[PDB]
Structures are given as C-alpha cells and as structure tokens.
C-alpha cells in the first residue's frame, strides 16, 4: 500500500488551448444509452449497447466575459491531470464540445462572482493513461 493519489491542485485545463486556470471544478462523463431487452428463454434480461453521448459540467470564478463572448461556438477542452508524487500524467481532450447555456449573469450579495457552464461533447481522446 502506498500513496499515489491525485489532487485537483494538479488539474490543468486548456479551454480551446488557453489555460483557464480560474476554474475550480470540472467533471465530464461519457454515457451510453444501453438498451435492455428481455429474452423469452433467458431468466436475466439482456443489455445491448447503444450510441454514446458526452456531457460535461464546468464551473469556476468569473474573471472576464470569455464564455459570454464565446457563445455557442464549437471548441475544445483539454484536461491534464499530473501526478506529482511520482511522474506521469493523464491527458484528455473533448473532441468537439458546445455550451448548452451561457451563464450570462450571476451574482449575489458580497459573494465572489461565480460562473457555471454546462454543455455536451461529441467525442473524446485519451492522450495519456495515468
């Protein structure tokens, strides 16, 4: 047993090839509409794969009008997670992603102006596997 975990401090995100270092949360999932159909002779139901759909959520602290200016244009998100205790790093890129809604305005009381972005992505590429 050894400590080889990873921390969000190591996260590096290039929104369209630009380091959006101000994003303090990110998550992306690649789900499949697995059809499940029940066969006559088989007791247990059979699950059949289907087409995949990529969704991603990304929220941070506002520092400019980047996303509002970006609009619904297609773009790319490159995510790099690097182990610092030992060398090696994971690197992912969402092949073609679009926003589902512009967080046009958001603010409340004395709190910092947080920004939340949600969208979908067609596909992905796994550039490094650790």
């Amino acid at each position: 047993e050894e400590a080889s975990f990873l921390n969000g401090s190591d996260v590096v995100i290039l929104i369209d090839g630009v380091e959006e270092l101000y994003m303090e949360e990110i998550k992306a999932d690649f789900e499949q509409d697995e059809q499940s159909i029940k066969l006559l002779g088989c007791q247990n139901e059979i699950s059949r794969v289907g087409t995949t759909k990529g969704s991603f959520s990304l929220n941070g602290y506002k520092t400019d009008s980047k996303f509002a200016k970006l609009g619904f244009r297609s773009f790319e998100i490159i995510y790099n997670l690097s182990n610092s205790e030992t060398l090696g790093y994971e690197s992912i890129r969402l092949k073609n992603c679009r926003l589902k809604k512009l967080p046009l305005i958001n603010s409340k009381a004395g709190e910092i102006v947080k920004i939340e972005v949600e969208g979908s992505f067609r596909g992905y590429d796994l550039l490094n596997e650790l």
Partner: protein, 206 residues
C-alpha cells in the same frame, strides 16, 4: 367467491379454471332494433323481435404450481381442441352469476419473458343457441337444450329390449332398425331383433 367451470359434454370433461378472470368481467346487452325516419316526423325506433348473440371475454394465466391443477400446455391443448368443437359448452361463473351454454369464439396463449412455465390466456365466449329445424294443437315448447352425450357403443343390460335402447339412446325409439341394420349389430345380435342378451355390445349410429 368466484369460480369458472366449463362443462364440455361431447368430451365428458368438467374443466375448472385454476385462476380467476384477472381484472374484471363484463357482459353487454343491446336490444335488437332498427331506426327508420318518416317524412315530416323524423326518426323512430322499431324493435326487432329476435334476440342478439352477446360475448363474454376475459384473460388469465395458467400457473405451473399452485386447488386441482394440470399442466398449462395440456390445458391449452385441451381448450384449443374445444375451439373447433361444434357441440356447445356449458359455462358457469359463480360470483358473476352467469350460467348458460356458450362456445369459444377465439383463444390465445402467451409465454412472457419470465414465468416461462405459465401461459397467459385470453379467451372469448359467444352465447350459444340451437336451430330446431299434423293435428295442430297447443303442446309443450321445445325450449330445453338437448345437450346430453352417450358412448358410441352400448353394452346390453338384462332388462333391456331393442326398442328401449333406441329410445333411451337414439330418441324416438322407433329408430331401432337403424341400430339393427348395422352389419356389426346384425352379426352380434341374433337374426331375431326381438331377442337380445345381456353383455352383447351394440353400436348406435352416428
């Protein structure tokens, strides 16, 4: 309490449904009538004297293990055989209070994905009726359905006579020569029709 009984007679089988008819029974009744319009008066309803055939339908499942029981496959084979039966079936439904001769119009079984042993059944019945094709005078009506069946081969008893066998087993009783003229009956019976013995096997016609 509710039960369903199908008392087939051409096959002496008294089937009792293992399972009650699922969600809800229902029987319609619709008076047999026609509509006619009359100039400067409009529509009118004319009753037609005859009655109307009405249907009873429901659905069940024949379970594999349960109170008397039988295999669902054989039961389906039993009912599917009965569908083609020209003779009528007696249907009795206790709680619904239905009792009368019917005939199965349609029948269908089904094996669901699970529960492969059971067979979901959907059955429909039609009310049955009969077609009964000198010295005119009032007499008893011929309302009684004649649903009764006997073996096609008769074993003569001690007190029997050929006329008596004809009446008990072929109706009018004067029908005895039909029994006698069959060559098998002629062979077993003596040349005298009036003489007969306990035992002799005899074959009623039809």
């Amino acid at each position: 309490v509710i039960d369903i009984y199908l008392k087939n007679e051409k096959e002496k089988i008294d089937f009792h449904f293992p399972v009650n008819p699922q969600d809800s029974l229902s029987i319609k009744k619709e008076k047999r009538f026609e509509t006619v319009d009359i100039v400067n008066l409009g529509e009118f309803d004319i009753k037609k004297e005859g009655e109307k055939i009405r249907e009873i339908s429901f659905k069940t499942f024949l379970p594999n293990l349960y109170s008397e029981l039988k295999n669902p496959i054989e039961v389906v084979a039993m009912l599917e055989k009965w569908v083609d039966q020209a003779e009528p079936l007696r249907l009795i439904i206790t709680g619904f209070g239905y009792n009368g001769l019917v005939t199965i119009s349609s029948f269908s079984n089904t094996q669901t994905a699970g529960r492969e042993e059971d067979r979901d059944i959907e059955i429909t019945f039609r009310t049955y009726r009969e077609l009964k094709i000198s010295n005119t005078k009032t007499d008893l009506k011929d309302n009684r359905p004649n649903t009764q069946t006997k073996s096609k081969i008769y074993t003569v008893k001690a007190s029997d006579t050929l006329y008596k066998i004809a009446k008990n087993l072929l109706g009018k009783g004067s029908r005895w020569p039909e029994i006698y003229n069959i060559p098998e009956n002629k062979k077993v019976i003596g040349k005298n029709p009036n003489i007969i013995k306990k035992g002799k096997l005899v074959i009623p016609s039809k």
